[PDB]
Write a protein that binds this ligand. Sequence first.
Ligand SMILES: [Cl-]
Ligand SMILES: [Cl-]
Length: 164
Amino acid sequence: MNIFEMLRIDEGLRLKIYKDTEGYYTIGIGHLLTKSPSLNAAKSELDKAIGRNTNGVITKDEAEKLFNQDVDAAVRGILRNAKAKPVYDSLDAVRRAALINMVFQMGETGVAGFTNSLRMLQQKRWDEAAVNLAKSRWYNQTPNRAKRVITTFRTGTWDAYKNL
Ligand SMILES: [Cl-]
Ligand SMILES: [Cl-]
């Protein structure tokens, strides 16, 4: 298991524009296109990202390419974030993947409301952190996914992803 396989399980793979859990147009492996209600705007953003007139449809390779870019960006985003960096550097490899997954899903903006949880992770107080992470809109909206990531932070193993 690794970050790519982990997110592929959590986000799935769709080759046509679809609406995510929050109702935003997305494609591929969880690649958000825009928060705008406009399908046209979404198709436009898609063409801009792929470099061609797609007609709201892409190939598997194109999806994987977007994915590679998106993971790289999340990692780079963490490294540049003054609050997240110290946490990321303190964690072991498995746990780092869990932090990447959150950032990929909710962005630096979302991860920003997790100040207290991040501090517990940095302190290595695993059970406490798991409890705090669960008191969030994130957990109430996407509980199954949140449970998988939380278990990852709690245990430091990929157990929640084995079977999927
Ligand atoms: Cl892009
Ligand atoms: Cl879920």
